[PDB]
């Protein structure tokens, strides 16, 4: 387990190994955060989230 094989490369969602090194990305409706790992919802009711309200 090196890159994306090691704890998903620390990515919140999609992890891909580009020319070595980890690169994270997110599903539509989310934007990659400043740390380039977390995924932040673009608006209300982002995909994959159980509705709490």
């Amino acid at each position: 387990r090196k890159l994306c094989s090691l704890d998903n490369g620390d990515c919140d969602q999609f992890c891909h190994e580009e020319q070595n090194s980890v690169v994270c990305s997110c599903a539509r409706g989310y934007t990659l955060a400043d740390n380039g790992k977390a995924c932040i919802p673009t608006g209300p009711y982002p995909c994959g989230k159980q509705t709490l309200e």
Binding site: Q13, C15, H16, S25, A27, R28, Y45, C47, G48, T51
Partner: peptide, 20 residues
């Protein structure tokens, strides 16, 4: 119209979905 009990599931990317 999304609301409580109405929301979409996420479509993943193939490679990541299959390996992870």
């Amino acid at each position: 119209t999304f609301r409580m009990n109405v929301a979409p599931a996420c479509l993943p990317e193939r490679d990541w979905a299959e390996s992870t």
